Chains A and B, each alone.
Chain A
Amino acid sequence: SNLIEVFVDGQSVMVEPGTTVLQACEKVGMQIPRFCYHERLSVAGNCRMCLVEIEKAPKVVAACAMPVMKGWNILTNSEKSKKAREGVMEFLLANHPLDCPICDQGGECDLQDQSM
């Protein structure tokens, strides 16, 4: 068919053209970290938490908004992607209030779990 071959951590998978990097990662079986992306809502690209490294690419792309093309090898657990996630969480938590004991979303917070 028109399906194209993309690699996630060296594992090949067929994806329809127009599929984002995040959707390919879900197809392989991994969940890219996210804060602003919702499947039922339009793509925004604000939180930059879904930043993932494409092999042989010097710039980290946003997996939620970047359509994937043939031949890409998505390095989700690479050092660059981990450092990008750590930086994004540090910036997110720089101005967050210390309200966890009084917050109504204590044990079900995406911020808490993704920071952990």
Chain B
Amino acid sequence: ASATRVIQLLRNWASGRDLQAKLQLRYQEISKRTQPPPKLPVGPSHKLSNNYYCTR
């Protein structure tokens, strides 16, 4: 976050933990909203032979 050093020390002392280690506001570390195309593999019953429906 965009916080001054003195305020950061004040918060860390008052809470008792290191806030900047684990912030609760999401930043650039999240994934992009645009993603490459997927492929989504087919299931196990997509065979061209030995796939009669009466057996499964």
> Chain B residues near A16 (CB, 8 Å)?
none
- Size category of the B interface is under 10
Contact with A along B35-56 (1 / 0, CB 8 A): 0000000000000000011100
Chain B residues contacting A79 (CB-CB under 8 Å) are: 54
A110 at the interface (CB under 8 A from B): no
Report the Cα distance A83→B52, complex, angstroms: 7
Cα–Cα distance between A79 and B55 once the two chains are bound (Å): 9
Q: Report A-chain residues with C-beta under 8 Å of the C-beta of B52.
A: 83, 86
- Interface residues in A64-116 (C-beta closer than 8 Å to B): 79, 82-83, 86
- Tell me the A residues contacting B by CB distance below 8 Å: 79, 82-83, 86
Q: How far is the CA of A44 from the CA of B52 in the complex (A)?
A: 28
- Tally A-B pairs: CB < 8 A: 7
For residue B55, which residue of chain A has the nearest CB?
A: A79
What separation, in Å, do the CA atoms of A79 and B52 have in the docked complex? 10
Would you give 7 A-B contacts (Cβ < 8 Å), ordered by A? A79-B54, A82-B54, A83-B52, A83-B54, A86-B52, A86-B53, A86-B54
Residues on B with C-beta less than 8 A from A82 are 54
- For the complex formed, measure the closest distance between the CB of A24 and the CB atoms of chain B, giving whole angstroms: 23
**In whole angstroms, how far apart are the Cα atoms of A82 and B54 in the complex?**
7
Residues in A whose Cβ lies below 8 Å from that of B53: 86
